Amino acid sequence: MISLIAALAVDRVIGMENAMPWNLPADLAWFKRNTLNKPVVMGRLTWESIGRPLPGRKNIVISSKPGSDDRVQWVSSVEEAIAACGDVEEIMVIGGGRVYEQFLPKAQKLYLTHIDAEVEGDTHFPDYDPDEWESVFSEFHDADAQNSHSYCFEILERR
Numbered sequence: 551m552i553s554l555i556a557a558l559a560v561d562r563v564i565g566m567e568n569a570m571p572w573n574l575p576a577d578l579a580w581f582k583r584n585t586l587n588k589p590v591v592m593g594r595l596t597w598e599s600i601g602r603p604l605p606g607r608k609n610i611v612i613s614s615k616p617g618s619d620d621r622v623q624w625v626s627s628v629e630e631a632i633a634a635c636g637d638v639e640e641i642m643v644i645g646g647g648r649v650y651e652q653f654l655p656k657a658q659k660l661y662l663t664h665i666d667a668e669v670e671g672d673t674h675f676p677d678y679d680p681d682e683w684e685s686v687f688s689e690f691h692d693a694d695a696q697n698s699h700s701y702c703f704e705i706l707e708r709r
């Protein structure tokens with residue numbers, strides 16, 4: 551099964567100047583919890599935004615250049631990227647925007663972190679039709695010491 555996991559600011563902003571315009575440890579924990587023991591897939595600039603694989607996970611990145619790296623599996627499209635996962639129950643897509651867009655029709659579940667902050671960004675999460683998803687899980691958290699802005703964790707499923 552395919553799923554997308556993302557942190558969304560106000561009006562769906564996900565990134566600015568090859569980075570994320572916030573720092574939330576709670577959402578980091580949520581990310582780590584739901585991406586654990588699952589394979590992850592990302593685009594080039596995101597991989598380059600990290601530069602180091604996720605521990606004990608099968609890391610897959612999508613591109614049009616030769617693998618500049620041997621510690622990760624390189625793929626050039628969507629359907630063979632799924633075949634690059636094998637016989638798995640759940641596949642994780644962690645970004646970014648164009649990957650989100652291409653896999654959103656493929657995705658059957660959405661792990662969304664709703665960040666309550668309006669901030670600046672060049673990249674957005676694909677507009678999904680709220681007609682197409684329903685919320686099975688909603689967990690709201692106000693901002694605190696470690697968390698600069700409030701946030702709400704949500705799990706969506708297709709219909």
Ligand SMILES: NC(=O)c1ccc[n+]([C@@H]2O[C@H](COP(=O)([O-])OP(=O)(O)OC[C@H]3O[C@@H](n4cnc5c(N)ncnc54)[C@H](OP(=O)(O)O)[C@@H]3O)[C@@H](O)[C@H]2O)c1
Binds near residue numbers: 555567595599615648
């Ligand atoms: N808040 C969040 O949840 C979060 C999480 C992750 C990332 N982000 C942010 O979002 C931004 C990244 O998103 P993005 O839209 O810029 O890029 P992206 O989707 O992560 O990466 C796209 C890259 O992957 C390659 N690619 C994608 N599909 C391909 C295909 N079908 N065939 C061949 N290559 C393909 C493309 O290069 P080529 O096609 O030329 O090879 C392209 O350069 C970053 O700024 C990051 O900081 C935010």
Ligand SMILES: CCc1nc(N)nc(N)c1C#C[C@H](C)c1cc(OC)cc(-c2ccncc2)c1
Binds near residue numbers: 577581602603644
């Ligand atoms: C807030 C992070 C985050 N939060 C939520 N709720 N969803 C997400 N999808 C992401 C994210 C992300 C990006 C794609 C990412 C890619 C990556 O590709 C290797 C490694 C990491 C990462 C390696 C180690 N420690 C922290 C993050 C993050």
